[PDB]
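To: structure subgroup
Subject: Chain for Friday's discussion

All,

I'm putting the inputs and outputs inline so they're searchable in the archive.
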Amino acid sequence: SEPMRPGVIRFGLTPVADLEVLDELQAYLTQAVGQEVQLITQRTYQEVTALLVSGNLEAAWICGYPFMKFRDELDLVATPLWRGKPVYQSYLIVGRDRDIAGFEDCQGDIHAFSDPDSNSGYLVTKTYLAERGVSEEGFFRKSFFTYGHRNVIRAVASGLADSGSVDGYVWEVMKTTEPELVAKTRVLVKSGWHGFPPVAAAAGQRKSQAVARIRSALLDMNQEVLGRSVLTRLQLDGFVETTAESYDSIAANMERVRRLG
C-alpha cells in the first residue's frame, strides 16, 4: 500500500499515425494537461492494454475488443468522432483487379490480419468465419498478423496477401494520404457499425487528477489551434463521453466467437 507513481504522465497507444502526427499529439497533450505527457507506443494491443491494466500508463488509446475483454479493470475516458459519429467498420480488402464476388471466394487465400486483439483487424472477420463453422487455419491456406492496419493495406497492395482485414477509418484516411497505394486495393466487405476505438484508464483511477486532465484535454481538443491541427491530421472531429453500452456490438461478437468452435 506504499503508493507507486510515475515520473511523468504516460499516454499509451499503437502507432496509429506517422511520427510527426504523434509528436504533435504529444505536444498538444503536454500543452492542455499543463505538464509533460509522454506518448508510449507499443506494437500490439495486448501490450498497450496490459501496461494500462497493471497501472504502468495513466491512459491508453486501445480498441473496443481489449476494452470489453478487461471491462472490469478499465474505465472509458472518451471515444473519437469520425465523419461526425463515434463508430467505424471493418473492411475486408482484396487487390483492385481481383475477380471475385464475395467472402466465400476468399477460401484458400493468404489472409493478412492486423492484430489478434483488434476488433476491425481480426474479431469481425473471425465472426464471419465462426458463423460459417470455419477458422482461419481451415478456411485460408495461410493467415498472419501485420501488427498495423496500414501494413494490412501494404500486404494486399504488394500481393503478399490475397485478402486482408483492416480498420475502415485507416483505409479511408490512407486513400487521401497514399492514394496510389490504396488504389491497388478495393473493399470486398464492409461490416456492421462498432464503437470507435476508445481512450481508457485503469478502473482504480476515477479520482485521478492525471486522468481528469487527459479527459478534459480530449473533450476540449477543438478549443485551441494545436488540438485542431492534430485532429485534422488524424481526420477526426474530436472526442465525446461514451458508456460501455456503445461497445455492446463488439461484446456480442466476442460472445458469438466464444460459443462457436
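Points worth raising on Friday:
The radius of gyration is 19 Å.
The domain at 9-86+195-243 is CATH 3.40.190.10 (D-Maltodextrin-Binding Protein; domain 2).

D.
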